[PDB]
Amino acid sequence: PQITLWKRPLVTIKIGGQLKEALLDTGADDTVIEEMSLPGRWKPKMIGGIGGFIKVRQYDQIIIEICGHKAIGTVLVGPTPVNIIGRNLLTQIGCTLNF
Amino acid sequence: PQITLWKRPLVTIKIGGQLKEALLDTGADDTVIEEMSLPGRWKPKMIGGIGGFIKVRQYDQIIIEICGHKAIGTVLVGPTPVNIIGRNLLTQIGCTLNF
Ligand SMILES: CCN(CC)c1ccc2c(COC(=O)N[C@H](C(=O)N[C@@H](Cc3ccccc3)C[C@H](O)[C@H](Cc3ccccc3)NC(=O)OCc3cncs3)C(C)C)cc(=O)oc2c1
C-alpha cells in the first residue's frame, strides 16, 4: 500500500511471535527494536543518531511480518524510544518513496 | 519520482542560495540541516533523537527546493552527520511510502 506522511508511518509488525508497532524509516540503514527477547546467538555492534549513540545486539535471518509482508533479515535489539524498520527490510517488502 | 531504497534516499536541495545533499527521512518529524548560516531571527528548541538530544536553531517559512519541488516551512539548524528532510517538508512535495 501507498502510505502518505501527514502522520508518522507506524505499522504493525509480528516478530518472535509478538505483535508490535514500528516506524517505517527511510532514514535508517538498519532495523532496531526496543527491549524484547529474541532467540539465538547474538553478535555485538553499536549505532548512531541525532543526539549521540547506543549499544545493541544483532540477530541474523530474523523473520518479521510487516503489515503482512514477510521479510527475513538482520534485526537489532537494544534501546530506542520507538521501534524502527530500516532500509534492510524496507527493500524486501518492496517499499518505495514517491513524490 | 518513485525512489526505491536499495541505496539511501539522498537528494539535492537548494536552501539559502546554497546547494546541498540531504536524506529523505520518513523517521523524522522535523527537517534538520548541518551547520549553515541561515539569515533571519531564530527561536531556540532542542530536538531529540537516538542518543539523546542536540540543540538547534529554528527558522520558520524557510524556502527549500527538494529535487526541484518547492516547499516552505520550518527548518532547523544545529549539528548532524547528515542533512535530513523530515515529514514537515515531505508532505509538501507530495512524498509517499508505497509497498
Ligand atoms: C557509507 C557511510 N558509512 C561510513 C560513514 C556509514 C554508513 C552508515 C553508518 C551508520 C548507519 O546508521 C544508521 O543508519 N542508523 C539509524 C539512524 O539512527 N538513522 C537516522 C539517520 C541519522 C539521523 C540523525 C543522526 C545520524 C543519523 C535517521 C532515523 O530516521 C532516526 C531514527 C530514529 C527516529 C526517532 C527516534 C530515534 C531514532 N531518526 C532520528 O534520529 O530522528 C531525529 C529527529 C528528527 N526530528 C526530530 S528528532 C538507526 C535507527 C539504525 C551508522 C554509523 O555510525 O556509521 C555509518 C557509516
Author numbering:
A (entry chain B), B (entry chain A): 1 to 99
Cite, word for word, the article reporting this structure:
This 99 amino acid long homodimeric aspartic PR plays a pivotal role in the viral replication cycle. In the assembled immature particle, the PR domain of Gag-Pol cleaves Gag and Gag-Pol at nine distinct sites to create the mature, functional subunits. Proteolytic processing results in a dramatic rearrangement of the particle core termed maturation, which is a prerequisite for HIV-1 infectivity.
The design of a photoinactivable inhibitor of HIV-1 PR was based on the structure of the PR inhibitor ritonavir (RTV). Compound 1 contains a photolabile 7-diethylamino-4-(hydroxymethyl)coumarin group connected via a carbamate linker to a RTV fragment, and is a tight-binding inhibitor of HIV-1 PR, displaying subnanomolar inhibition potency (Ki=170±20 pM, for detailed synthesis see Supplementary Fig. 1). The crystal structures revealed that compounds 1 and 2 both occupy enzyme subsites S2, S1, S1′ and S2′. In addition, compound 1 interacted with the S3 enzyme subsite through the coumarin moiety. The extent of interactions with S3 residues was rather limited, however, and the coumarin moiety protruded from the enzyme active site cavity. The suboptimal interaction in the S3 pocket, compared with the interaction of the P3 moiety of RTV, is likely to contribute to the 10-fold difference in Ki values for RTV and compound 1. Binding of the P2′, P1′ and P2 substituents of compound 1 was similar to that of RTV, whereas differences were observed for interactions in the S1 and S2 pockets.
